[PDB]
Amino acid sequence: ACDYTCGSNCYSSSDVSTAQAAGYKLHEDGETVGSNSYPHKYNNWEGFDFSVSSPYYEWPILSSGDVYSGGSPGADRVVFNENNQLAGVITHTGASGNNFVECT
Ligand SMILES: [Ca+2]
């Protein structure tokens, strides 16, 4: 069973934790990776019900289980705040353009 399902992608809590930790470290270090410079700010204009406060940052979570190191980021993202709190898991999958929908 999946803890988070992003379209057809299946993620376990452990997967989320690993991705989050990588993203947060880069954030602390004032560093970014990839052509789209992740991690980057995330604006909650869609109003997802995140129980944690902003600012929020987004970092790619890969279907493969590997930690994002540049290259194609896919459609899935983990969202964390300034305090390294998990805000949620979201995806471009099933959303128009560059918009997002929440992973279930
Ligand atoms: Ca996995």
Swiss-Prot record:
One of its GO terms (molecular function) is RNA binding. It catalyses: [RNA] containing guanosine + H2O = an [RNA fragment]-3'-guanosine-3'-phosphate + a 5'-hydroxy-ribonucleotide-3'-[RNA fragment]. Keywords: Disulfide bond, Endonuclease, Hydrolase, Lyase, Nuclease, Signal. Its EC number is 4.6.1.24. It comes from the Eukaryota. Disulfide bonds join 2-10, 6-103. The active site is at residues 40, 58, 92. GO terms for cellular component: cell septum; hyphal tip. It is an enzyme of class 4 (lyase). Belongs to the ribonuclease N1/T1 family. Monomer. This is Guanyl-specific ribonuclease T1. The lineage of its organism: Eukaryota, Fungi, Dikarya, Ascomycota, Pezizomycotina. The gene is rntA. The chain holds residues 27 to 130 of 130 of the full protein.
